[model samples]
Target: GSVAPVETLEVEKWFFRTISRKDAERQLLAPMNKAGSFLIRESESNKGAFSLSVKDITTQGEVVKHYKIRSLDNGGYYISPRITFPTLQALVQHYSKKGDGLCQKLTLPCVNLA
Candidate 1:
């Protein structure tokens, strides 16, 4: 019974399996979310891709930006071609410390209620 159960168990904390682009924005823009707060969701336009939504503050107030997470056929995942990782969790861990190409480093994650 140890098949595919625990994988999502950890990512499910912030990796929303199903949700729309607008839905992602809503959650990140909510009052509780601050600049750098983020969530990962299955991509709509890119099909097999995933999207990273991060909240940021600007002169226009706070805004949520969507970054399309590209996937490699070999099971690698990457946001910027400069680097890649084997697991989604690994990518998050890297970005959590370094903004790198992200608007800002991943701060707090939006709670997953699914």
Candidate 2:
């Protein structure tokens, strides 16, 4: 049997953030550059789970990372995780250090994650 071809979307930019989900959704709605980044808030959902969503500024392709929060004995929640960088500024600095080579590589249609 022949399988139908699956349609795949290409992404132009990648957004990274470390903040609450509500703020993340808000930020995703705003206009963004071709290859830019941003920050998002961290919070618990009604289901008691935390999730981080990364979206392309142009194509609207989204990738979500999910997490579970553990309440501390005293108060608040505790979860040690690194979805995006602590700050968008910090993330920019990281790729900045990588220089042109990284930028060139990312522009290609196919990227080797490994």
Candidate 3:
């Protein structure tokens, strides 16, 4: 008897949304009825969320972001439209007032070539 070959399917694409540390905590601990994948925690630095890879569903998972909550495509490397404009602006203002340079807008929908 010969066994049939199995085809492997890879999920090369994924959608992601970034949120603040506080928001992440809230989402993770919130009731299951209110829980959502968007509540995952991600870091802005290149070390974690900034790392290039597929999105994870576990708690405190990292997802890339511009500076506010938005979606990104891991396969296409594209970023979704801005949602948390007020919060982002406030953060930028605080940094600027502290002598930091103006915050730059996040660029989305990045494509990775590898």
Cα lDDT, all candidates: 0.74, 0.34, 0.29
Candidate 2 matches the true fold with a TM-score of 0.28
Model 3 lDDT, residue 18, Cα: 44
Stretches > 4 Å off in candidate 3: 1-15, 33-39, 47-114
Q: What lDDT would candidate 2 get against the real structure?
A: 0.34
Q: Which candidate do you rate higher for lDDT, 1 or 3?
A: 1
lDDT of 2 by residue, 1-114 (tens): 877687534222233224556555444434431222323233434332233333343345543223334333343333343323444333334544441222211222112122
Model 2 misplacement above 4 A: 1-19, 32-35, 40-55, 58-91, 96-114
RMSD of each: 3.4, 16.5, 16.1
What is residue 75's positional error in candidate 1, in angstroms?
A: 5.9
lDDT of 3 by residue, 1-114 (tens): 777687534211112234455544343333331112222234565333321121123456543222223323322111223222233334223333341221222121123223
Q: Residue 101 error for model 2, in Å?
A: 12
Q: Could you tell me which residue pairs clash in candidate 1?
A: none
Best by TM-score: 1
Best of the two (1, 2) by TM-score: 1
* Model 3 whole-model lDDT (C-alpha atoms): 0.29
Whose lDDT is higher: candidate 2's or candidate 3's?
2
